[PDB]
Amino acid sequence: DTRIPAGEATAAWQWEVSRDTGEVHAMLCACDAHQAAASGTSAPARRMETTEHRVRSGSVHLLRHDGRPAGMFTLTWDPPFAADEGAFPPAERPLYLSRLAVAPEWLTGGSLVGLRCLRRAIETAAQAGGDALRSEANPDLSATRSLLDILGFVQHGPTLSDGQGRRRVHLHKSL
Numbered sequence: 001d002t003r004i005p006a007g008e009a010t011a012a013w014q015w016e017v018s019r020d021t022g023e024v025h026a027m028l029c030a031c032d033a034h035q036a037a038a039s040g041t042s043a044p045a046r047r048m049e050t051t052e053h054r055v056r057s058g059s060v061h062l063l064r065h066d067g068r069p070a071g072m073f074t075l076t077w078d079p080p081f082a083a084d085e086g087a088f089p090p091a092e093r094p095l096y097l098s099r100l101a102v103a104p105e106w107l108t109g110g111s112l113v114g115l116r117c118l119r120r121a122i123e124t125a126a127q128a129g130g131d132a133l134r135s136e137a138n139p140d141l142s143a144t145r146s147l148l149d150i151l152g153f154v155q156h157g158p159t160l161s162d163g164q165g166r167r168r169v170h171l172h173k174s175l
Contacts, residue, residue, distance in 0.1 A: 015120065018060040018072065025051045027062075027069050031101040038107075039140050044166070050080075054099070061124065063117060070106050071117040074099040075124055081136045087157025087170040091132035094172075095125040098135065100144070107143075114144065118151055126175045133173045140167055 018024050025048055032043035054060050054074045062072040074080070080098040088094070100121075106113040125133045139145050139159060153171035160168050 012066050013070070013116075014064045016062050016064065017058050018055055018062040021048070021052050021055045023069060024055055024060050024062065024072065027072055027103060028099055028101045030104055031107070034104040034107055035138075035141050035144070039138075039142065041138070041140050041166070060099075061120060063113070063120070065106075069103060071102045071113045072099070073097055073101070073117050073121045075121055079134070081170075083134075083136070083170045084157060088134055088172045089132070089154070089156055089174075091134075091172070093129060093131040094134050095128065095130040095132070096134050097121050097125070100135075114147055115151075118147065122151070122173065122175070130175045132175055135171045135173075137169050137171055138167060139169050145169075
């Protein structure tokens, strides 16, 4: 006797494979600006070419609320960063999480949109046959870093500085 909750409030949240490049890039840059202001850092330089490539490949999963984009992530089989791979535990079929973004209006309160996006990414990576979910994070973004730590993303290698004041870490979650 299974009871899945229906109702319009539940249906207000909809997941999709994104096909709108400008929407994805605007969401990403807005989240970048919010987190950079909140953490005293500078927002990273985002490439619209990368956005186009990820959207064209069907790698961008976007969560909408009443039609407006609330969160998203990018899930790929190929690494979007050049980590030593010794900075990760061994894995035979790793998937890679990148460009996690939550709309600034959902970065406060208790709607748990970031948790929704990370849960969606973990699930999707597991269903695609994934051995692990690897990601590159900014440890200076305290809230996202703590959410990744609570969800089981382990840092294996050392913290890296890019030479221009930006810190990054490589996280790995077993699936």
